[PDB]
PDB file of C-alpha atoms in Angstrom:
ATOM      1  CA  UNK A   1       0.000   0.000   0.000  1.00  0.00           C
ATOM      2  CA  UNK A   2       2.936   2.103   0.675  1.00  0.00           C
ATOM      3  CA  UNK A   3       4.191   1.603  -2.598  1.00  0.00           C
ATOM      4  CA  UNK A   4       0.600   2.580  -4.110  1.00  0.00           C
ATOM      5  CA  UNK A   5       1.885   6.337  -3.539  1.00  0.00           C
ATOM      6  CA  UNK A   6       4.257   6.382  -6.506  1.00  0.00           C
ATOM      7  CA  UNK A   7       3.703   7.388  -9.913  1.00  0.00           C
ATOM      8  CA  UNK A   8       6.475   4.854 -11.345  1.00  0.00           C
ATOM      9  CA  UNK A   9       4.936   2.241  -9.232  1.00  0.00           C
ATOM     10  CA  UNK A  10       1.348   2.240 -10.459  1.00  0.00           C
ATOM     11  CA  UNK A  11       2.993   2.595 -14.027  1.00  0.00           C
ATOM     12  CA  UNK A  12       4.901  -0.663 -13.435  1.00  0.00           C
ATOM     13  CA  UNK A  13       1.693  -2.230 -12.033  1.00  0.00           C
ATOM     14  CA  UNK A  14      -0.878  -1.479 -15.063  1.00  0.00           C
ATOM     15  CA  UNK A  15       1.508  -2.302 -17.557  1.00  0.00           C
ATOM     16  CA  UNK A  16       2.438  -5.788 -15.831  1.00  0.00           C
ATOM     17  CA  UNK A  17      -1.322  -6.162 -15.716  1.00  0.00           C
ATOM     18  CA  UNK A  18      -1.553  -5.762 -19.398  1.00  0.00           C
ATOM     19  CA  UNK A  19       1.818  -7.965 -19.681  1.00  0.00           C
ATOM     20  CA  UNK A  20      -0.215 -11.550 -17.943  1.00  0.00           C
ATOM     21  CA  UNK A  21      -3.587 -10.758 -19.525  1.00  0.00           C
ATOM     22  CA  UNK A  22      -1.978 -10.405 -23.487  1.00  0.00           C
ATOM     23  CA  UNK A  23      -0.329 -13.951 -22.011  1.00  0.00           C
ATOM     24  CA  UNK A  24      -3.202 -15.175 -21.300  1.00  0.00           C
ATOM     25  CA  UNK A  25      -5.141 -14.529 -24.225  1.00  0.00           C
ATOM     26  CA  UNK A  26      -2.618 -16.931 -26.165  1.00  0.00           C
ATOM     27  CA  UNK A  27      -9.284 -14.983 -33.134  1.00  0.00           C
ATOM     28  CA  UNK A  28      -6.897 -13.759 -30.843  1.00  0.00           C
ATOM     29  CA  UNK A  29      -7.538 -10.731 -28.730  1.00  0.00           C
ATOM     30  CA  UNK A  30      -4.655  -8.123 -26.997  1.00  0.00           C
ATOM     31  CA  UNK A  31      -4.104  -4.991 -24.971  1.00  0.00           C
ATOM     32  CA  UNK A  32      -2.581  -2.645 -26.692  1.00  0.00           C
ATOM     33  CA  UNK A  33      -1.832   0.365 -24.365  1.00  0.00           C
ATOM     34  CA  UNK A  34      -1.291   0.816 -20.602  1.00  0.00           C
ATOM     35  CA  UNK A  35      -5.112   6.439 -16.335  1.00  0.00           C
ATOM     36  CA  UNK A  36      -8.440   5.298 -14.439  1.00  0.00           C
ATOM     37  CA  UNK A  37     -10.655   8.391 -13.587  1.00  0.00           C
ATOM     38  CA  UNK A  38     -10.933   7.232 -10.217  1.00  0.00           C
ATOM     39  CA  UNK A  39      -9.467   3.882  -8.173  1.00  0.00           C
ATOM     40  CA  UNK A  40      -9.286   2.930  -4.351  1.00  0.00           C
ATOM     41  CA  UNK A  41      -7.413   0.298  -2.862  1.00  0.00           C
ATOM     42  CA  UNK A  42      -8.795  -0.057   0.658  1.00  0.00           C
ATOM     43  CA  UNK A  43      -9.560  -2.538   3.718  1.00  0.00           C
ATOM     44  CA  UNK A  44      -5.498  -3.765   3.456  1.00  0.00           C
ATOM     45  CA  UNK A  45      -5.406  -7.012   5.392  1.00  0.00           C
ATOM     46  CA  UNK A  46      -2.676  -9.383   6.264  1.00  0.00           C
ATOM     47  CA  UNK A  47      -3.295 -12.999   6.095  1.00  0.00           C
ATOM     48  CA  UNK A  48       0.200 -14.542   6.451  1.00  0.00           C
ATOM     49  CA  UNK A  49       3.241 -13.010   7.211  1.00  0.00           C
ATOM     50  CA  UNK A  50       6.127 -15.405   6.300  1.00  0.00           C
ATOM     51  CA  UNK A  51       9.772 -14.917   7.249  1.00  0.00           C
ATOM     52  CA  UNK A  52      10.374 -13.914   3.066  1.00  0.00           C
ATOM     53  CA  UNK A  53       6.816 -13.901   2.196  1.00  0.00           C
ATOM     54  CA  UNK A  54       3.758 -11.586   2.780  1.00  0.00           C
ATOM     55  CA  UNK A  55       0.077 -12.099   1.790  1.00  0.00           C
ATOM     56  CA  UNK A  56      -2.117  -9.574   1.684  1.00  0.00           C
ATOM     57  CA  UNK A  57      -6.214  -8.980   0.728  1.00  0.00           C
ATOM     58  CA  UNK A  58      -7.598  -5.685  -0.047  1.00  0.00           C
ATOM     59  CA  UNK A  59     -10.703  -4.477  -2.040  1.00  0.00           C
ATOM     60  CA  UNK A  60     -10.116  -3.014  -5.623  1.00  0.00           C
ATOM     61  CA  UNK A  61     -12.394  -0.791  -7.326  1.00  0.00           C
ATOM     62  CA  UNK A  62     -11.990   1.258 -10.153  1.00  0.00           C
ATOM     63  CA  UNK A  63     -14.403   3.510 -12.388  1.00  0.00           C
ATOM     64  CA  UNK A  64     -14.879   4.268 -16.218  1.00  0.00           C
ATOM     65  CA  UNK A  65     -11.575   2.751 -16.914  1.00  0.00           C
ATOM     66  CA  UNK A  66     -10.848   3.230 -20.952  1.00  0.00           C
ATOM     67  CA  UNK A  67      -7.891   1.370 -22.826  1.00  0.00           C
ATOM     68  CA  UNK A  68      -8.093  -0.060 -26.338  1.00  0.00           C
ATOM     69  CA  UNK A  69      -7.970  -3.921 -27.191  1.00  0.00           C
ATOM     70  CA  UNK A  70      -7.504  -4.825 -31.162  1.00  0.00           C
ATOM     71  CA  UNK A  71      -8.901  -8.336 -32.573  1.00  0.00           C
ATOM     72  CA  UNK A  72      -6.776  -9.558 -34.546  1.00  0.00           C
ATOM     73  CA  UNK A  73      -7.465 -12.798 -36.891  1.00  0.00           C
ATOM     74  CA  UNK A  74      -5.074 -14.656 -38.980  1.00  0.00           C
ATOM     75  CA  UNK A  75      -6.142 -16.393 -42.271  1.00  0.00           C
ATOM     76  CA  UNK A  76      -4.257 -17.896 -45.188  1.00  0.00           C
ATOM     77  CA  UNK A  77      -1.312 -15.802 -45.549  1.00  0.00           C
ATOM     78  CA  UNK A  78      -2.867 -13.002 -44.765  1.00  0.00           C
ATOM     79  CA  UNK A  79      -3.565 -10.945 -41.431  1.00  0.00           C
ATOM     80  CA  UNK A  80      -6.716  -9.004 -40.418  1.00  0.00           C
ATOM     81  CA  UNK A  81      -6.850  -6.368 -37.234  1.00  0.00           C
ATOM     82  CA  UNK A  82      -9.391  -4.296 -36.273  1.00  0.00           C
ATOM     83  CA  UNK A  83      -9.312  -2.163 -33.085  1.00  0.00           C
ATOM     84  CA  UNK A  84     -11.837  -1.102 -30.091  1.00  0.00           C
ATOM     85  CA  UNK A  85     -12.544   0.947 -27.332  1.00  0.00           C
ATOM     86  CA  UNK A  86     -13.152  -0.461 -23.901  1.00  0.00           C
ATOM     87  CA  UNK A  87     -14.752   1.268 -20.861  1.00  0.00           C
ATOM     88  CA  UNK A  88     -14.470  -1.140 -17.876  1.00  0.00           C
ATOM     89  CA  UNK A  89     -15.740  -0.499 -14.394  1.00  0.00           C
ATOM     90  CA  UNK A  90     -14.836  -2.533 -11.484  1.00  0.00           C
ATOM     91  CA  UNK A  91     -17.112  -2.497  -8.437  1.00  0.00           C
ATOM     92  CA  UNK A  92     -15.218  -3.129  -5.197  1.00  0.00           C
ATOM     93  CA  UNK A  93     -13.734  -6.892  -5.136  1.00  0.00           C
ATOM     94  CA  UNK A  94     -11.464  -8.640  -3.057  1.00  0.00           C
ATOM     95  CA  UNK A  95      -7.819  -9.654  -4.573  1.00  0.00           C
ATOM     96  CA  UNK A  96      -4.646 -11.378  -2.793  1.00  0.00           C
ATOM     97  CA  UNK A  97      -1.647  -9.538  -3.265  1.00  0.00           C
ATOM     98  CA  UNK A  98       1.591 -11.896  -2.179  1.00  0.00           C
ATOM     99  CA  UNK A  99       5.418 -10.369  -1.637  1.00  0.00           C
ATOM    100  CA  UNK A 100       8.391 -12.626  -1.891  1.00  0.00           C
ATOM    101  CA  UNK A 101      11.825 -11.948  -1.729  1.00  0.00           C
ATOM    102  CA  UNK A 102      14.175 -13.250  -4.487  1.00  0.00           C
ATOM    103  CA  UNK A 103      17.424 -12.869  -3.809  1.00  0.00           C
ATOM    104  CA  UNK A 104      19.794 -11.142  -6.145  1.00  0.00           C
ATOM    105  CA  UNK A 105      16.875  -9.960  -8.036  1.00  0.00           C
ATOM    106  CA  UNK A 106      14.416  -8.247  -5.731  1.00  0.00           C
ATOM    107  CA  UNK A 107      10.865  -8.496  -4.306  1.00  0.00           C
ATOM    108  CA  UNK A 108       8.578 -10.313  -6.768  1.00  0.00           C
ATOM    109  CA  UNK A 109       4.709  -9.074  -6.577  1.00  0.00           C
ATOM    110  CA  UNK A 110       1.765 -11.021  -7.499  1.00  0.00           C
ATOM    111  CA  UNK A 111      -1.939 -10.233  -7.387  1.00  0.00           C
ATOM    112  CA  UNK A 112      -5.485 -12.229  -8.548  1.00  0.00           C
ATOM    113  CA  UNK A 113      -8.845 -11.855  -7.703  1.00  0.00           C
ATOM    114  CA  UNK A 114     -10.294 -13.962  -4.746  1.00  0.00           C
ATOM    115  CA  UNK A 115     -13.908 -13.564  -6.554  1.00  0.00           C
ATOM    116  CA  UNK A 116     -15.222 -13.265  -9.758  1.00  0.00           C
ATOM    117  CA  UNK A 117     -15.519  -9.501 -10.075  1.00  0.00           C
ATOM    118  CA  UNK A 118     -19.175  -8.558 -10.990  1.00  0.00           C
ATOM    119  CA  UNK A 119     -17.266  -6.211 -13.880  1.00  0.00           C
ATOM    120  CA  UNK A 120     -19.454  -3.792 -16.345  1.00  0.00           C
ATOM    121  CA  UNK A 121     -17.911  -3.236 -19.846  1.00  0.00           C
ATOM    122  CA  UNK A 122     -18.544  -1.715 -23.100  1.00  0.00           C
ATOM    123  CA  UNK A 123     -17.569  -2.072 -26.625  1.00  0.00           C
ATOM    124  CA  UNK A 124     -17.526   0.060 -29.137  1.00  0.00           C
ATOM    125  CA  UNK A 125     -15.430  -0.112 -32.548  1.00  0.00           C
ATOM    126  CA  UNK A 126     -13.064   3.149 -33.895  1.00  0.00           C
ATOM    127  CA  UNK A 127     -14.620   2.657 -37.620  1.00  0.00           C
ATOM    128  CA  UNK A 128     -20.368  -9.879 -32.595  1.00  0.00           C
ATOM    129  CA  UNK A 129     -19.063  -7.239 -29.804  1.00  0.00           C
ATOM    130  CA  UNK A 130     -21.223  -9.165 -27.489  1.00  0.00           C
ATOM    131  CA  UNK A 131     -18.353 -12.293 -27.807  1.00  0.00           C
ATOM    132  CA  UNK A 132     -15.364  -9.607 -27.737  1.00  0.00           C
ATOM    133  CA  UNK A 133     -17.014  -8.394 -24.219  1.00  0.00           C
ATOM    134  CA  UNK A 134     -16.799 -11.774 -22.882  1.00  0.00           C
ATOM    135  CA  UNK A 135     -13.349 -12.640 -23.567  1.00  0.00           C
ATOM    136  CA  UNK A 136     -12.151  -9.363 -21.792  1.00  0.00           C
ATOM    137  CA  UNK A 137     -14.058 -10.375 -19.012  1.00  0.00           C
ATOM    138  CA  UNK A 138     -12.480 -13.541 -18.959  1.00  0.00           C
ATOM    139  CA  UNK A 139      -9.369 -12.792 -19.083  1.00  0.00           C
ATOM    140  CA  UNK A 140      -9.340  -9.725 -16.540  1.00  0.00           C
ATOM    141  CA  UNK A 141     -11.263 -12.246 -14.253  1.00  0.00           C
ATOM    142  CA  UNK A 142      -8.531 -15.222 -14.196  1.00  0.00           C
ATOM    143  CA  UNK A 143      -5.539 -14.028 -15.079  1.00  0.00           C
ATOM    144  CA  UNK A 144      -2.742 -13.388 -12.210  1.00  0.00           C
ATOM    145  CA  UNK A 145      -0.350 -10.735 -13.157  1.00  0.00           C
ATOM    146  CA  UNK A 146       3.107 -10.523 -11.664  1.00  0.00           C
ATOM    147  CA  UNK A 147       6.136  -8.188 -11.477  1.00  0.00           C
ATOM    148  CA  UNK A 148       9.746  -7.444 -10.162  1.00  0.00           C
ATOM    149  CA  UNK A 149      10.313  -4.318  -7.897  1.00  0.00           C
ATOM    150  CA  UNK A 150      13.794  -3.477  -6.348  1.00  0.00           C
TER     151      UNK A 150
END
């Protein structure tokens, strides 16, 4: 939570997000860019304390959240993309975060939802997005990013 303060952190943290979700979308879908008009972390909660680890549980929320995600499908020898815009919204949901020290390399973060997050997203193209809606939700819903700090 400390860490939630700085700028170069919560940089670091969206764009490891985006890192594991493009992973685990291997149509194929991807994140293209890294913000939110308003985010909280809040209730931060210890579960185990380790003599290198640390778990945590907190609640995440965020609002109107906009990035763009492109479809992209291959064919033969040939390559189609087209591009959308996304507006998420996260209600408040509960998510592990666990610290562990590595050494030589530094403190290794990982975070994934306890719950499926009752998440609220539109589509829109930039000129079926019913199916394109669900596999954003499914990704953001399973996927457990991770990242190296110092």
């Amino acid at each position: 939570a400390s860490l939630f303060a700085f700028k170069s952190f919560r940089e670091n943290w969206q764009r490891a997000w985006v890192r594991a979700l493009n992973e685990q979308a291997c149509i194929q879908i991807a994140f293209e860019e890294v913000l939110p008009p308003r985010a909280s972390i809040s209730h931060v909660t210890c579960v185990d304390q380790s003599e290198h680890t640390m778990v945590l549980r907190c609640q995440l929320s965020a609002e109107e959240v906009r990035f763009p995600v492109s479809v992209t499908q291959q064919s033969p020898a040939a390559v189609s993309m087209e591009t959308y815009h996304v507006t998420l919204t996260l209600p408040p949901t509960q998510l592990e975060v666990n610290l562990e020290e590595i050494p030589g390399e530094g403190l290794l973060i990982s975070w994934a939802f306890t719950d499926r997050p009752d998440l609220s997203l539109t589509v829109l193209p930039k000129l079926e997005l019913s199916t394109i809606e669900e596999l954003i939700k499914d990704a953001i819903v399973s996927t457990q990013p991770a990242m190296m700090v110092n």
